[PDB]
Amino acid sequence: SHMYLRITNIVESSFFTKFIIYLIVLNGITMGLETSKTFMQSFGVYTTLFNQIVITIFTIEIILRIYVHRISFFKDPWSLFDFFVVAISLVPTSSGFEILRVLRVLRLFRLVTAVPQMRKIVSALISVIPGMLSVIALMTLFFYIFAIMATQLFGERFPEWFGTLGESFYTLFQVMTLESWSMGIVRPLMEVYPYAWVFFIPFIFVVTFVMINLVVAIIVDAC
Amino acid sequence: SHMYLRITNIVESSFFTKFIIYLIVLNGITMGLETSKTFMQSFGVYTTLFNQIVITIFTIEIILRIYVHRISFFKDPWSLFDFFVVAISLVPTSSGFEILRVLRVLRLFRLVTAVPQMRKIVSALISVIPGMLSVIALMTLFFYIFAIMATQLFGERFPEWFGTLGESFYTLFQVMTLESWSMGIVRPLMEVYPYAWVFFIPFIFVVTFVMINLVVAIIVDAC
Amino acid sequence: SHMYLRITNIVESSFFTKFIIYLIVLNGITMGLETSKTFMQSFGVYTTLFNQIVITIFTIEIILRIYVHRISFFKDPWSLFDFFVVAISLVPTSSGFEILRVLRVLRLFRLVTAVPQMRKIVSALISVIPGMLSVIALMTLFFYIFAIMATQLFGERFPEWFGTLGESFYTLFQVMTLESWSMGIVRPLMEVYPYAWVFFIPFIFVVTFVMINLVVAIIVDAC
Amino acid sequence: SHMYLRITNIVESSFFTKFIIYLIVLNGITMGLETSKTFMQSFGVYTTLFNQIVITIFTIEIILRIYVHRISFFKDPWSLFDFFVVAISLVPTSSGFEILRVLRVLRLFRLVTAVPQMRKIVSALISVIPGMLSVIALMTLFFYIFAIMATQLFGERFPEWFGTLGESFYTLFQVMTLESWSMGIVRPLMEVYPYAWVFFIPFIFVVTFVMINLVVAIIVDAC
Numbered sequence: 018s019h020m021y022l023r024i025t026n027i028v029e030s031s032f033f034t035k036f037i038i039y040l041i042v043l044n045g046i047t048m049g050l051e052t053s054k055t056f057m058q059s060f061g062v063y064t065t066l067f068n069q070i071v072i073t074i075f076t077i078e079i080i081l082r083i084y085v086h087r088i089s090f091f092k093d094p095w096s097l098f099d100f101f102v103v104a105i106s107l108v109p110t111s112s113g114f115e116i117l118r119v120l121r122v123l124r125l126f127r128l129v130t131a132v133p134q135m136r137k138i139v140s141a142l143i144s145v146i147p148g149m150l151s152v153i154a155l156m157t158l159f160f161y162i163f164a165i166m167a168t169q170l171f172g173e174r175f176p177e178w179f180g181t182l183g184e185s186f187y188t189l190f191q192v193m194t195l196e197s198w199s200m201g202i203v204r205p206l207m208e209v210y211p212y213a214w215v216f217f218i219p220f221i222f223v224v225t226f227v228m229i230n231l232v233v234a235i236i237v238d239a240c
Numbered sequence: 241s242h243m244y245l246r247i248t249n250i251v252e253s254s255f256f257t258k259f260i261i262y263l264i265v266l267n268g269i270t271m272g273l274e275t276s277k278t279f280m281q282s283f284g285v286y287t288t289l290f291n292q293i294v295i296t297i298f299t300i301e302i303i304l305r306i307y308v309h310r311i312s313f314f315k316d317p318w319s320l321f322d323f324f325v326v327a328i329s330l331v332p333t334s335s336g337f338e339i340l341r342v343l344r345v346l347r348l349f350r351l352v353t354a355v356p357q358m359r360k361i362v363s364a365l366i367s368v369i370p371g372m373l374s375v376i377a378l379m380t381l382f383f384y385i386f387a388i389m390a391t392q393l394f395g396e397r398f399p400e401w402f403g404t405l406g407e408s409f410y411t412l413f414q415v416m417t418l419e420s421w422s423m424g425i426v427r428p429l430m431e432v433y434p435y436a437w438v439f440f441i442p443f444i445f446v447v448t449f450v451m452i453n454l455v456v457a458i459i460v461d462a463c
Numbered sequence: 464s465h466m467y468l469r470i471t472n473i474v475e476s477s478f479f480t481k482f483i484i485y486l487i488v489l490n491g492i493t494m495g496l497e498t499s500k501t502f503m504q505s506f507g508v509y510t511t512l513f514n515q516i517v518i519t520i521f522t523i524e525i526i527l528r529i530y531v532h533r534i535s536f537f538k539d540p541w542s543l544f545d546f547f548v549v550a551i552s553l554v555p556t557s558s559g560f561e562i563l564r565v566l567r568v569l570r571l572f573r574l575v576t577a578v579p580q581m582r583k584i585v586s587a588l589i590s591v592i593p594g595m596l597s598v599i600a601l602m603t604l605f606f607y608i609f610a611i612m613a614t615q616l617f618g619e620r621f622p623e624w625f626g627t628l629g630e631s632f633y634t635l636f637q638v639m640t641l642e643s644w645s646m647g648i649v650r651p652l653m654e655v656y657p658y659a660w661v662f663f664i665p666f667i668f669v670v671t672f673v674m675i676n677l678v679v680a681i682i683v684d685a686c
Numbered sequence: 687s688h689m690y691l692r693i694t695n696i697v698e699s700s701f702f703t704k705f706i707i708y709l710i711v712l713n714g715i716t717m718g719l720e721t722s723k724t725f726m727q728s729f730g731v732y733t734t735l736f737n738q739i740v741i742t743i744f745t746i747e748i749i750l751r752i753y754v755h756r757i758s759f760f761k762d763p764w765s766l767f768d769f770f771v772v773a774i775s776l777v778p779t780s781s782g783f784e785i786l787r788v789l790r791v792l793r794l795f796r797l798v799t800a801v802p803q804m805r806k807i808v809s810a811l812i813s814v815i816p817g818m819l820s821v822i823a824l825m826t827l828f829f830y831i832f833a834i835m836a837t838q839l840f841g842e843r844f845p846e847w848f849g850t851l852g853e854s855f856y857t858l859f860q861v862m863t864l865e866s867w868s869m870g871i872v873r874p875l876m877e878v879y880p881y882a883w884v885f886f887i888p889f890i891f892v893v894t895f896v897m898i899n900l901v902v903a904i905i906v907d908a909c
Contacts, residue, residue: 165275169275
């Protein structure tokens with residue numbers, strides 16, 4: 018435990034944290050810049066290397082933290098995130114699709130993990146998630162039922178919006194958000210199915226009512 | 241109570257319920273695939289056969305439950321649903337409209353009945369319904385008053401959106417959801433009726449205020 | 464007080480009320496019908512006379528109520544409404560504009576006055592109005608300030624939406640409701656005024672924040 | 687305290703305040719008319735003259751208040767506003783941009799300062815601001831992360847909406863307000879990026895959930 022505690026002193030050290038938070042904010046500022054074609058035609062490679070540096074440093078740091086915690090680590094939501102967020106950043110710039118190449122910017126999310134209050138907020142938000150799964154389940158069931166009916170009621174003449182179980186899923190979500198649901202979807206639809214309003218108005222009521230209730234439940238049970 | 245009790249311990253059995261819930265999730269998955277033209281051609285008839293089976297099994301099951309409960313059953317909302325939902329699934333594939341054929345997917349709602357907690361949610365939600373009928377009535381009255389005025393104020397030059405008492409009902413509901421209410425309806429309407437904004441702004445106010453007051457009456461009462 | 468109390472017995476009588484509520488619902492049903500060109504080409508005049516009858520009866524009834532209450536009447540919000548709602552219905556079908564001819568249907572609103580619970584609801588809703596005048600004032604001030612700035616910043620090149628203090632008032636309200644504020648108004652506007660987003664985003668924040676607060680105040684102060 | 691106290695009893699006087707509030711509502715009305723080209727031509731110069739007068743009077747008044755308070759004044763938010771608001775009104779009509787010329791109508795905001803209750807409202811509102819900076823920070827971080835990813839995922843083929851870190855910022859805010867988010871942006875985007883819905887639906891979820899959780903944290907804490 019000499020080398021160990023010698024490390025634990027660095028890892029648990031203040032300098033360490035602040036230093037990582039420093040690279041987060043420094044790297045974060047560099048990715049908004051590496052966004053400019055112009056800037057990349059100047060300080061282009063600079064930013065590229067600096068990004069390679071930061072990631073190395075972050076791998077070292079992720080390793081050091083594994084020593085000091087080991088099993089305790091792979092049971093920490095926050096460390097697990099930082100783990101997978103750096104691994105993605107590790108996948109070679111080439112091969113497969115550029116998703117990984119873009120998901121890379123997900124590292125700036127470590128400024129939520131590497132900073133309390135942010136952790137508190139995020140924790141507080143998520144705390145509610147579990148209490149809504151009963152409703153979130155009821156909803157997804159509802160959506161599935163209707164998406165199926167819409168695919169087989171309008172997918173024929175309106176393939177763009179309902180030709181597929183998934184196309185219907187997307188359209189029904191757009192209707193839920195109320196986004197041009199009438200001018201954009203139901204009016205056109207009615208030019209062929211005069212009673213389509215019988216399918217959609219009720220759908221907008223249930224989904225709305227639930228959403229509203231879902232919130233009134235949270236507010237109400239507390240105070 | 242010889243044959244009766246034999247029937248009851250089965251109907252009232254754990255196996256029974258779970259077996260019914262299993263057919264729900266199986267038929268449910270099957271109707272999702274039955275949505276695919278490809279699968280329709282590559283695994284169709286079997287799916288068609290499976291559906292007929294499920295419904296048969298459900299009729300047997302619905303009968304067994306009326307034995308074990310009789311008059312108790314017809315007074316249970318949850319069973320009444322399961323009743324009418326399977327009945328709809330009974331009407332022959334042909335004849336009349338295909339809605340009865342598309343309405344069958346409504347059986348997947350038995351998973352709300354056959355599963356507690358789901359029952360609780362749906363119960364919790366509906367519990368509020370009656371506590372809003374006063375407002376829901378006031379609103380519907382409001383809508384009727386305005387739908388009539390708009391039909392006779394704009395239906396002449398704007399048949400599509402207000403030519404009928406019901407077309408006005410639809411448009412006013414769209415205005416309530418605030419969907420394209422200005423670019424879509426009022427701006428165009430004003431190209432002919434410069435003061436039309438005198439009709440719609442107040443309407444959007446009343447309807448909005450009431451909606452909000454409605455939700456505020458709900459959570460406030462809780463704390 | 465013999466003839467008087469003899470009247471007061473009729474006016475305060477149950478039969479009376481129910482009888483007026485009967486004509487309300489009967490007349491209300493007739494105005495939704497008198498909405499159909501077809502129906503008016505059949506039972507056309509019938510409905511016309513029946514509407515004349517109802518209004519006469521309502522004038523008698525309004526007179527009888529003045530006797531029984533006198534000064535107490537012109538201090539009753541509900542009676543005052545019924546008063547002005549019938550007077551409008553009294554103005555000759557001809558002369559001036561058809562507004563009066565259409566405002567006529569405002570009488571069906573007497574089913575809110577002529578029925579408790581409806582009265583309660585409406586009373587409960589309005590109860591809050593006075594407590595929001597401080598905010599409603601702040602808002603209108605805000606709107607006036609911005610409507611002025613927008614008229615003089617965009618009315619030049621965008622006269623349809625801001626060429627007038629009032630055109631700007633309408634557009635700013637549409638922006639508040641968030642109705643195609645971006646695609647419809649700001650994007651187009653930015654094709655000429657690159658920083659227009661500096662005027663509108665802040666406007667959407669203030670207006671939104673306030674609206675939200677305005678409600679959180681109500682909810683919160685109670686329980 | 688000879689000249690000082692003479693100055694104070696005037697500045698601290700009822701007359702003074704009311705006189706200032708009177709000029710606000712007068713100048714306020716005047717700027718509404720100054721909005722009319724007709725009035726501009728039919729009553730213009732007088733209006734122009736009146737405005738110069740008002741501002742002079744307000745400078746005198748702003749000076750008198752710094753005497754009576756001195757260092758106390760510069761530490762008062764309400765007076766600081768009135769200060770900077772009149773200063774802007776001082777910059778010569780010409781030179782630079784006309785914004786300083788349009789920003790003058792911001793003086794009508796002194797009616798929020800010069801009138802209590804208005805001060806209270808604005809104070810009550812702002813009181814909450816600090817109690818949300820944790821979330822407002824988390825959100826802005828979120829927006830930055832996504833604005834960067836979208837600029838490099840769609841800015842190439844969709845310059846208008848995502849070609850710049852800031853164009854993406856604008857579009858993502860529009861998506862947040864849910865304005866044309868589907869018909870307007872995602873549907874079109876999918877014509878090239880079929881999985882783009884994987885980016886936007888989750889974004890609309892996080893942003894929505896947080897917004898709601900935000901308002902729920904506010905009223906709950908109150909009861």
